[PDB]
Design a protein around this ligand. Structure first.
Ligand SMILES: O=C(CCC(=O)Nc1cccc(Cl)c1)N/N=C/c1c2ccccc2cc2ccccc12
Lengths: 188, 184
């Protein structure tokens, strides 16, 4: 079976941290490809902004288009509302019978896996890949694959605050995404 | 209504980072107290006995910290919705503030029964100075400096037979090395 990584999130915006993690897992586990899986976001409760599906998808394209081994999976983003990861992976399993899915999660996610919807059934659909800091181990009763990656501290929350302050985020994310964000006045 | 915080996790082991977060939220939102909510771990795992004892030792001297056994009172893991449904039933006079890491926030829409859970708790997202949380849901933000102590860091130090002095309460360290936890 084809070894394919999945990295999910809202990518709001995508940045070098996401690419670094995707790349590290790609090399560490000798994957064929990594699919970025943009999540759906429910409409805001209190008349504030969420970043459109259109904008998030385009930023993601700009962030990944340079890498032949990165692709985008629209399974969640095409639906009307959020999806449980179990339901998504069930659907990807039906659509791609010959793929072994390696589902990337942060080290801090790991202790909370037992609280995921249909976790037991999901374990039969994917191999989890927990990203841990150098030399440190993840503790979980579940079978998981560990990949070591330094914590680089860049986050979407950091970048949004900078854009709110009308600063550049050059060197924290692909040039092309920075250009797109400031041009369309995102995160202001 | 009494304002009470909830901080959940496996606490494996509890450490100054957990206490720092509970304390910051306690002070920021003028809470009555904060309840530590140990999670169940499905079938090496640290025994419930051991995790509870460590939590007890970690919170012994803290006046405004208590332990809530709700999730340990059930056999297997619980969704947070299940837990908060029971706690709201048990404490109708309480406004619960459920503490989550800033990294959790974008994934809230994937939590089981999130819409119904929003009717049961106020979420408190903790964020590093300079970080802005973004979610469609009502949430309260509390600024907390990152501290870089984690249970994973500690477990590895103990496996290497290093001390974790200054990273968690003395009484917890003593319990850990006496009982040989994290030795493997
Ligand atoms: O889809 C996901 C995680 C995807 C992800 O973890 N992607 C990712 C993306 C970039 C880098 C890395 Cl290290 C990981 N599910 N997350 C849900 C989720 C919980 C769901 C139910 C019950 C509890 C949950 C707790 C979570 C805590 C942190 C982060 C996510 C949590």
């Amino acid at each position: 079976m084809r070894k394919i990584g999945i990295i999910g999130g809202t990518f709001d915006p995508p940045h070098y941290g996401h690419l670094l993690i995707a790349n590290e897992v790609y090399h560490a586990l000798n994957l064929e490809e990594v699919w970025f899986l943009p999540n759906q976001i429910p409409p805001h409760k209190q008349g504030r902004n969420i970043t459109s599906v259109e904008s998030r998808l385009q930023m993601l394209e700009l962030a990944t288009e340079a890498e032949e081994h990165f692709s985008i999976c629209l399974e969640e983003l095409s639906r009307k509302g959020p999806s449980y990861t179990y339901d998504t992976m069930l659907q990807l399993t039906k659509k791609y019978p010959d793929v072994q899915f390696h589902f990337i999660i942060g080290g801090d996610m790991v202790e909370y896996l037992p609280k995921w919807y249909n976790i037991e059934a999901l374990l039969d659909l994917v191999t989890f890949v927990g990203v841990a800091r150098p030399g440190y181990k993840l503790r979980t009763p579940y079978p998981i694959t560990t990949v070591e990656i330094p914590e680089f501290a860049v986050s979407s929350s950091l970048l949004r605050e900078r854009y709110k302050e009308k600063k550049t985020c050059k060197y924290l994310l692909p040039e092309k995404v920075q250009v797109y964000i400031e041009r369309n006045g995102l995160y202001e």
